[PDB]
Design a protein around this ligand. Structure first.
Ligand SMILES: [Cl-]
Length: 544
């Protein structure tokens, strides 16, 4: 009987789209090895206390995401609303990945994969086979007039139908629309019916993704040219560390992967009992998720190095330097494996399930929070399923601007600004500030000692008071001083209106805390200092 494996299985899944898709693309965008020096360090902080913090706030107060902060500090109660806005913006574009994966799945039910060869309608005349790119006849006699890889051209001109800019929306893609509608219908059915068939299927849903990742890693390591990719992934560049965008991406990757600032962990902590040693389980889950991300990065960069040594170009210019790196990398190694159809279907089902689990968790948490906001209004009678369907339809309609011709730019904007970036750093800094300098570190340490049984070391308090807030403030100041506009595939410059829309989407969640502060100050009766003292005092009992 393995205690650690059993407790990590019963606790909850820790694999999703934030480690095989977010981490590899963020690492490839930020120079590769140079992305690992800050991230890992940041990881520790951004992994160990903060996540555990959300586990304790939900365990101590025994509340959800919105009502937990109403006991620690009624003044800074806008963190719950900020997390709700963040998850509402995340459910829009995070499920779009499940539409691209679904479309790839329906295109992998044939013997010959379409992205393998250039003999197709969507391919341009500049399409060339990867094996012919280094052939002496084509590489020497024929000039390299912007000849692109077949997989990249297939992806762009058949899945995204990329436009010259975001100003050009184009025509709506019926295939992506139908795939997204089917995924949303599956999500609505699983939510309204309730997912209770996980009594024994958890073993499969946990072993199959890890088995596929292991197979892909073994295949990538046994491919020629993987050494260059491994070196590019491991050997850092000190020049990239000066860029503030690298630190921002490194900080937001962990907050995205560990579901931090989403309020889901605060709800999961309420499910845990009071006298429960959550510290060990949190550390184990964090270390396992970090190891899974580190292993997936090895496979991604080995595939990238193989593609580089086959085509004959630099490692930083092999594929798209943005969202969609896995779809270029992994299908190539799948085609390189015998029987590409079976392995492709397996990988697509794995990715679809990993995305659907996180989507179910996030949407159920959001719906539960919105229902707890107005219980008698959104719970009595049949209005609960009506509200669920309304939220699903609104999210699907808001996700129709990312499946168009000019929809990839909106997807990049939502990935960079809406559910990640400045918003998550702001929320984490405010949470750490309220925990350390407002609520106190010693009282929380005594509470954790009473709950789990032993008082932790000085790492958590120092990270809540010093490490995480100062790091977040420094990253924000560095992004403000040396500000570079967002770029797509390092070749497209976003217009001023797109940057303004992204900053507005970010501020929509960022301003949830200051506005709630003003609302609470105006609602409370009395002098300003008396109101501040009343709203900073832990009025509601924290379940001592
Ligand atoms: Cl990660």
């Amino acid at each position: 009987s393995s205690k650690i494996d059993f407790v990590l299985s019963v606790a909850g899944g820790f694999v999703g789209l934030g480690n095989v898709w977010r981490f590899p693309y963020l690492c490839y965008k930020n120079g590769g090895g140079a992305f690992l020096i800050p991230y890992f360090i940041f990881l520790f902080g951004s992994g160990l206390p903060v996540f555990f913090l959300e586990i304790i706030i939900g365990q101590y107060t025994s509340e959800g995401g919105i009502t937990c902060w109403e006991k620690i500090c009624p003044l800074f109660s806008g963190i719950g609303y900020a997390s709700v806005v963040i998850v509402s913006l995340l459910n829009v574009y995070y499920i779009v990945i499940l539409a691209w994966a679904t479309y790839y799945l329906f295109q992998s039910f044939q013997k010959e994969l379409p992205w393998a060869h250039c003999n197709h309608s969507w391919n341009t005349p500049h399409c060339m086979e990867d094996t012919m790119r280094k052939n002496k006849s084509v590489w020497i006699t024929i000039s390299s007039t912007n000849f692109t890889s077949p997989v990249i051209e297939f992806w762009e001109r058949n899945v995204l139908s990329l436009s010259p800019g975001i100003d050009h929306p184009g025509s709506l893609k019926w295939d992506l629309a139908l795939c997204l509608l089917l995924v949303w219908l599956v999500c609505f059915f699983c939510i309204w019916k309730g997912v209770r068939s996980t009594g024994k299927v958890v073993y499969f849903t946990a072993t199959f993704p890890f088995a596929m990742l292991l197979v892909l890693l073994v295949r990538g390591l046994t491919l020629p040219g993987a050494g260059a990719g491994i070196k590019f992934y491991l050997y850092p560049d000190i020049t990239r560390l000066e860029d503030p965008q690298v630190w921002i991406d490194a900080g937001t990757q962990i907050f995205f992967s560990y579901a931090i600032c989403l309020g889901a962990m605060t709800s999961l902590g309420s499910y845990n009992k009071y006298k429960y040693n959550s510290y060990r389980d949190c550390m184990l889950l964090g270390c396992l998720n970090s190891g899974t991300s580190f292993v997936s990065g090895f496979a991604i960069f080995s595939i990238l190095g193989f593609m580089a040594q086959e085509q004959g170009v630099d490692i930083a210019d092999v594929a798209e330097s943005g969202p969609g790196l896995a779809f270029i990398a992994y299908p190539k190694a799948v085609t390189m494996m015998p029987l590409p159809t079976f392995w492709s279907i397996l990988f697509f089902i794995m990715l679809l399930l990993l995305g659907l689990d996180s989507q179910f968790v996030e949407v159920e948490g959001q719906i539960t929070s919105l229902v707890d906001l107005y219980p008698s209004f959104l719970r009595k009678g049949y209005r609960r399923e009506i509200f669920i369907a309304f939220v699903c339809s609104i999210s699907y309609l808001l996700g129709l601007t990312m499946v168009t011709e000019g929809g990839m730019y909106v997807f990049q904007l939502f990935d960079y600004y809406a559910a990640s970036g400045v918003c998550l750093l702001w929320v984490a800094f405010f949470e750490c500030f309220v925990i350390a300098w407002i609520y106190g570190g010693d009282n929380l340490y005594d509470g954790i000692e009473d709950m789990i049984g032993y008082r932790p070391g000085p790492w958590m308090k120092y990270s809540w008071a010093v490490i995480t807030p100062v790091l977040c403030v420094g990253c924000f100041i560095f992004s403000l001083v040396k500000y570079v506009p967002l770029t797509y595939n390092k070749t497209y410059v976003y217009p001023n209106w797109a940057i303004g829309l992204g900053w507005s989407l970010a501020l929509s969640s960022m301003l949830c805390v200051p506005l709630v502060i003003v609302i609470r100050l105006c609602q409370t009766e009395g002098p300003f200092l008396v109101r501040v003292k009343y709203l900073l005092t832990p009025r509601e009992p924290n379940r001592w």
